[PDB]
């Protein structure tokens, strides 16, 4: 609950089975380019290689997975401290947002607010988000090393069914926030109790009658058929 | 199916509070090569830390549910081979009684 940032993080293994320089880059929300994993860890605070490698590979013995990380280390060799890592992230906009102080300040915000927003969106939680990214790289390499199977996109355990409650929740949130910004409009007008209760009622009313689950008489894409007339042919029906 | 129900969605904190108290080392202090066989513990795709004897923890958590102390609609799985313990307080999961 809370805004619901639908930011999907992709951790990409560049190069194919039989191509040299198989690097690992990751597409970060609000950043145009895919940043080599290393720089992300550095921007997080995990600065030396091996401290970075410890977060990804958990067995010091497993040479196979470790050789697979050498290219990444080479890719992130340019950036050596936390600051230069954030600048590199900040350079790649956004738009770009020209100014040195501006770009380094950005990358801070993206890693805090848009990168791995579950876990925490709080400040001092680099350690948590680093180990997670490392758990992700571990899984990426585990599948590429043919030790694990590709994820079944059709496993029912990985699916959820939104019933009446979560459905209403989504729609009520949309409208209450529309009321909040109408409350702000009448407060701005009051340069010195006019809160339209119609928006909440008529909103829910629209959705549940049409079955067009969204705001409102200006719906598309909205998902039609969410609400429908109950079959009363037979009891079983 | 007749006996299918769908998880309403509970609070994760009583379980996160419970875990730490039952031998769960927090991720903030993890040192992979020190505890290398450590079972990684997740609560709603959020890695909270690790645990050294999951065997006993898993039994405690199961007894917690089967008593009612941990809600019965909460899902907890222990993949021994993968060294993982994932917990779901999560809404929308379809369940059946056995």
């Amino acid at each position: 609950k809370g805004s619901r940032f639908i930011s999907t993080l992709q951790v990409k293994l560049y190069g194919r089975e039989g191509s040299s320089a198989r690097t690992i880059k990751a597409t970060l929300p609000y950043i145009k380019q895919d940043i080599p994993i290393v720089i992300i860890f550095r921007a997080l605070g995990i600065i030396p290689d091996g401290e970075i490698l410890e977060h990804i590979c958990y067995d010091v013995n497993d040479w196979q997975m470790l050789e697979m990380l050498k290219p990444c280390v080479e890719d992130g060799f340019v950036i050596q401290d936390r600051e230069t890592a954030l600048d590199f992230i900040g350079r790649r906009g956004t738009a770009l947002g020209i100014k040195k102080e501006k770009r380094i300040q950005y990358a801070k915000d993206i890693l805090q607010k848009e990168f791995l927003p579950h876990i925490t969106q709080l400040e001092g939680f680099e350690s948590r988000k680093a180990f997670f990214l490392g758990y992700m790289i571990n899984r990426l390499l585990l599948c590429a090393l043919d030790r694990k199977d590709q994820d079944d996109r059709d496993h029912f355990g990985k699916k959820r069914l939104d019933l009446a409650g979560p459905l209403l929740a989504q729609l009520f949130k949309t409208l209450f926030k529309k009321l909040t910004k109408d409350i702000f409009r009448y407060m701005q007008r009051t340069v010195e109790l006019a809160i339209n209760a119609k928006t909440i009622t008529s909103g829910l009313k629209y959705a549940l009658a049409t079955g067009n689950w969204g705001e409102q008489k200006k719906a598309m894409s909205s998902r039609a058929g969410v609400s429908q007339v109950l079959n009363r042919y037979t009891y079983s029906s | 199916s007749l006996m299918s129900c769908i998880s309403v969605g509970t609070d994760p904190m009583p379980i996160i509070t419970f875990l730490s108290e039952w031998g769960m080392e927090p991720l903030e202090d993890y040192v992979p090569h020190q505890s290398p066989d450590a079972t990684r513990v997740f609560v709603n795709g959020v890695w909270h830390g690790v645990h050294r004897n999951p065997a006993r923890l898993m039994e405690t958590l199961r007894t917690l549910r089967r008593k009612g102390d941990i809600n019965p609609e909460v899902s907890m799985i222990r993949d021994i081979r993968e060294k993982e313990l994932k917990i779901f307080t999560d809404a929308g999961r379809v369940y059946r009684p056995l």
């Binding site: 609950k1 809370g2 805004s3 019933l163 009446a164 409650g165 979560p166 209403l168 929740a169 009520f172 949130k173 209450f176 926030k177 909040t180 409350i183 702000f184 407060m187 | 769908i6 309403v8 969605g9 809404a91």
Partner: peptide, 30 residues
């Protein structure tokens, strides 16, 4: 599902990003 929404969820939605320079307290449903 609906029961969980009214009793809980609905109250939480009412007070999350709500407060304006004006806050929203406990909710009541007739």
């Amino acid at each position: 599902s609906f029961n969980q929404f009214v009793d809980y969820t609905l109250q939480d939605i009412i007070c999350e990003d709500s407060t304006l320079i004006i806050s929203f307290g406990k909710i009541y449903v007739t």
